[PDB]
């Protein structure tokens, strides 16, 4: 009855008059001296956490006239192993602080023994099962899950308590991630991806698209990030297939990649080996443990903090032939325990879409320039390199690169986003997008204004905890702020 016989009688205005004047949205002007650099966390240096080595990886290669996924992985691994002479008795150089390093040594020895056993069999199976030795039981987290009981049967246990749900420990930014990105943004001398076929071009637009696609494929196939994409896709595909198929035994999975060298000769390269544990995965976040042992030429003693989770062995010496002559260098093996979930593996098999991202941003960049010249500028864009964009930093000042360099940089950024996924990255990107937009508005002198800038800064900073990738992104944002307001 009250509502039916209700008429508007200055209610809102009276209530607004009654309300205190402290309830207001005061606009804070955003000037060039207003923004401040992001506060990065302090603590021990961050350590490598990728599922495989990226810039320190080493591969044993053999010329094989086979396309991707054609040959038997075990035979390719055996042949690549044969190609190398100069093995040595393993010995521990940099041990895993919290682990049982002798178990890692015995794991490598058992891998070699099983390789020899299959070698002297004259029949290569598609998959090889590894014996459930004590070292592999420990390294793969065998029987580490606490027993599940009813609460009434353990309510009196003295130390029974809720799971640990504290904030992740913080870690400061380490310079090795920038070096990783620089290496991932470089040009390679060998093609890494061979795309499939499509229908014949019938329309002129299809011909223009094919020419531009040839240019883009040439630019992208010779990028280290593409090698990382292919390696990650293969590793995740093999891990998921093994986990679903044989979820009760330890399987030996070689890390293989197929490439084409600048002379046109196909090569199969072996990076290392992966041994998966029991993989009774039920939830999408259920973890399957594996032990990864990867070859490398990098001495861990130069950056020990980068290899906190790794145990490094000396497995041989290699006689590398250089331009001037031959030089002998030690050959190290990085052995560690890692884990992956169904969701992580699934998103690891779709790393190829990363390409699209960069490519799209590149194409729209060319077309926007071609729209105002009425001619396709792609060939003019990156055959004369007339147009350059600021894409780097140097001691002298900002560095500019061609559209090809920009494409490679965006591809590397997408790849690292895929390989370092975490809620921290999501939150930081989402929160820093607003600050980027505010800075852009300031650059367009659109009189930007903020209601609570310190709150936005706190929200951005709360997402920087221990991830090297997000810390590097924050450092990049700080550099951009420094250069975007001078």
């Amino acid at each position: 009855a009250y509502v039916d016989g209700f008429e508007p009688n200055g209610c809102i205005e009276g209530k607004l008059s009654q309300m205190s004047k402290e309830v207001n949205a005061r606009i804070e002007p955003f000037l060039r001296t207003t923004p401040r650099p992001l506060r990065l966390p302090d603590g021990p240096p961050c350590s490598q956490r990728s599922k495989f080595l990226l810039m320190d990886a080493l591969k044993l290669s053999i010329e094989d006239p086979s396309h991707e996924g054609e040959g038997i992985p075990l035979y390719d691994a055996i042949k690549c192993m044969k190609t190398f002479f100069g093995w040595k008795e393993p010995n521990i150089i940099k041990p895993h602080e919290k682990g049982i390093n002798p178990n890692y040594l015995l794991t490598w020895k058992q891998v070699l023994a099983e390789l020899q056993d299959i070698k002297n069999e004259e029949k290569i199976p598609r998959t090889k099962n590894m014996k459930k030795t004590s070292q592999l039981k420990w390294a793969l987290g065998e029987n580490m899950a606490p027993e599940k009981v009813d609460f009434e049967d353990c309510k009196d246990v003295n130390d029974l308590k809720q799971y640990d749900s504290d904030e992740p420990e913080p870690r400061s930014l380490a310079c090795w991630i920038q070096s990783e990105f620089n290496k991932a943004c470089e040009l390679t001398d060998s093609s890494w991806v061979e795309l499939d076929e499509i229908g014949e071009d019938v329309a002129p637009i299809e011909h223009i698209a094919s020419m531009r696609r040839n240019y883009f494929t040439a630019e992208v196939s010779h990028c280290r990030a593409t090698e990382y994409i292919m390696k990650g896709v293969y590793i995740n595909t093999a891990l998921l297939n093994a986990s679903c198929a044989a979820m009760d035994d330890f399987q030996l999975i070689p890390m293989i990649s197929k490439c084409i060298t600048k002379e046109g000769r196909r090569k199969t390269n072996l990076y290392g080996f992966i041994i998966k544990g029991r993989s009774h995965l039920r939830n999408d976040t259920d973890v399957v443990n594996f032990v990864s042992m990867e070859f490398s030429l990098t001495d861990p003693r130069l950056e020990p903090h980068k290899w906190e989770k790794y145990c490094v062995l000396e497995i041989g010496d290699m006689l590398l032939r250089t331009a001037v002559g031959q030089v002998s260098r030690p050959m190290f093996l990085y052995v560690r325990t890692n884990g992956t979930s169904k969701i992580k593996m699934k998103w690891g098999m779709e790393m190829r879409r990363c390409l699209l991202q960069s490519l799209q941003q590149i194409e729209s960049m060319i077309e926007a320039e071609s729209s105002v010249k009425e001619k396709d500028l792609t060939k003019e864009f990156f055959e004369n390199k007339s147009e350059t964009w600021p894409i780097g930093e140097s001691p002298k000042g900002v560095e500019e690169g061609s559209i090809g360099k920009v494409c490679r940089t965006l591809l590397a950024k997408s790849v690292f986003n895929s390989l370092y996924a975490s809620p921290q990255l999501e939150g930081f990107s989402a929160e820093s997008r607003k600050l980027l937009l505010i800075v852009q508005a300031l650059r367009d002198n659109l009189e930007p204004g903020t209601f609570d800038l310190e709150g936005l800064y706190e929200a951005i900073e709360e997402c920087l905890i221990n991830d090297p990738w997000v810390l590097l992104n924050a450092s990049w944002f700080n550099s951009f702020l420094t250069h975007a307001l001078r």
Binding site: S190, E219, L320, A323
Partner: peptide, 24 residues
């Protein structure tokens, strides 16, 4: 089309530590 980079140095990156030549 052969991609190239001005930062590509022909002498500084010796023996390609990632993918070297070791065949005897």
């Amino acid at each position: 089309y052969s991609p190239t980079s001005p930062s590509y140095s022909p002498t500084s990156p010796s023996y390609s530590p990632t993918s070297p030549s070791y065949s005897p």
